[model samples]
Target: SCSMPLGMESKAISDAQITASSYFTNMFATWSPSKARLHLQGRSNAWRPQVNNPKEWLQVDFQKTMKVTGVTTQGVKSLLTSMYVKEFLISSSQDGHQWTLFFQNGKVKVFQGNQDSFTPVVNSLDPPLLTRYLRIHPQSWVHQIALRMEVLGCEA
Candidate 1:
C-alpha cells in the first residue's frame, strides 16, 4: 500500500523537482511551478497554466522510479479570480521521453479534479504506477486551470 506522501507537501521534494509546461507570467515569480504543492498558501497557492487548454501540463520528477498509488489536487483562490481543474489525465514516464497514460479497465483514465477553489480532492490509483516522472494534463476547468498537488507512494 503506497501511503507516504512523495514530498510535495513537506518540501522534501525540492522546488527544482516541480515544473510545468507554462505558467501565468503576470505573477511569474509567485505562481511558478514550485508553488504547486498541496496546502501551500500566501500570494501564490497553486500552479496556473498560461494557456487554458488540454495541451498544457504540470509535471513532477521524483528523480527515481517509485510506486505512485494516489494523487491529491486543490484549486487556487486569488483576489482577482478563483480557478481549478474539473478533470484531467495522468501520464507517466521513466526516461522523460516515452510516456504512457494511466489506464483503468482497458481505457485511458480521466481523473475527476477539484470541485471548489480550496477543498482538496484525492484520486487513488488502484494498481499504482511505477515511474520517475509524472504529468498532469488538464481536460476541463473552471475560470482557468489552477492546481496544487501531492503524489502518494512508497519507495519502489
Candidate 2:
C-alpha cells in the first residue's frame, strides 16, 4: 500500500504539454500530430501517418522529470474511414531508451466527424513517477493511427 505525503504540498503538475517532439513515420508532409494540441484541429491539424504500421511511434520530451498522471488522447476522430489506434500502449522512460509500460492494451474508438472528440486516459502512480520521456507505442489498427495529445501532469 502507498500514501500521499500529508505535510508537504504537491502541485497539480500544470501545463507541461509537449511543444516539440518526434514521431516514427509520416505518409506525407505536414501529417504529423506533433503540431496540434487539441482534437478540433485533427483535420490536417494533428499528427497523422500516411499509412499505419507496427513500428510507428510518437514521443514527447517533458524536458525534465514530470509527475505524470495520464494523458488526453485525441485520435483521428474523423469519418469512419479515418485511421485510429483501436488498441495500443503508453510507456515511460527517463533516458528515452529503457521503457516501462504504463498502460497496456489501451483502446479507443472515437468516431463521427472531427471536432472535440477527446478521450482522457487517467493513470496515477502509487506515489507518482519522476517521468522524463513519454512514448506513444501505437500498434497498427483500422488503417492508420494518428493523434494530437496533451501530457497530463506536472513537474516532480
Candidate 3:
C-alpha cells in the first residue's frame, strides 16, 4: 500500500507571447519586454516601463491550453533600487480576449519590504486552471516597475 497521493508532473511553459504596457530603448536595439521569461540571464533580462502604474500590465500567451499550476515572479536584480512588485492582480483566459480573475476581490499586496530582486516570489494554485493565456495586472511597485516570470504547468 502507498501512502503518497497521486503526483502531477509539471514543467515550465516558456514558449509563448510575452508583452508589457511599455518598454525602453536607446542607442541600439530596444529592451523588449518579451525578455521577461525564465532563467536569470542577468540584468535587462526583465521588463519595465518608465514608471509602474496601475494602467500597466504584463501578459503571457501560452499559444495553447495548459493546466497552469504555479507562477514565479522576480524583479530586475542588478539595479540598486528595490524595483519589485508591491501589489498586483492576476488573470487567466482560454481565449486571448476574455479573462478570469486569478484571485478574488481586486488588487492584492502579497510581497512587502526587502523583497530581494534576485529572489523570486513563487506561488502555487490550489486547483490547477486550464488556460492558454495569463496576465499580470500591476497595481503598485516598491520603486519602479520591473518584472520577470516563470510559468509552471503542463499541457492540457
lDDT of 3 by residue, 1-156 (tens): 111111111224342377767876665435466766645465456677645587777887767887777777777654456667766777888878897876533544242322666677766654676888777777777777777777676657
Give candidate 1's total backbone clashes: 0
Report the lDDT tens digits of candidate 1 across residue range 1-156. 568898999999999999999988673345788999998988877888878999999999999999999999998887767889999999999999999999998899999998998899999997879899999999999998889999999987
- Candidate 3 lDDT score relative to the true structure: 0.64
List the candidates ranked by lDDT, beginning with the highest: 1, 3, 2
lDDT against the true structure, per candidate, is: 0.90, 0.51, 0.64
In order of appearance, the predictions have TM-scores of: 0.95, 0.61, 0.76
In lDDT terms, how accurate is model 1?
0.90
For all predictions, the C-alpha RMSD in Å is 1.4, 8.0, 5.5
Better of 1 and 3 by lDDT: 1
Structural RMSD, model 3: 5.5
Q: Model 2: per-residue lDDT, tens digit, 105-139?
A: 35332212223335533334433556887766566
Task: Please give the range of 10 consecutive residues that has the lowest summed lDDT in model 1.
Answer: 23-32
For candidate 2, the 10 contiguous residues with the lowest summed lDDT are: 5-14
Highest TM-score scorer: 1
- Candidate with top lDDT is 1
Runs in model 1 lying further than 4 Å from the true structure: 27-29
| 10 residues in a row with least lDDT, candidate 3 | 1-10
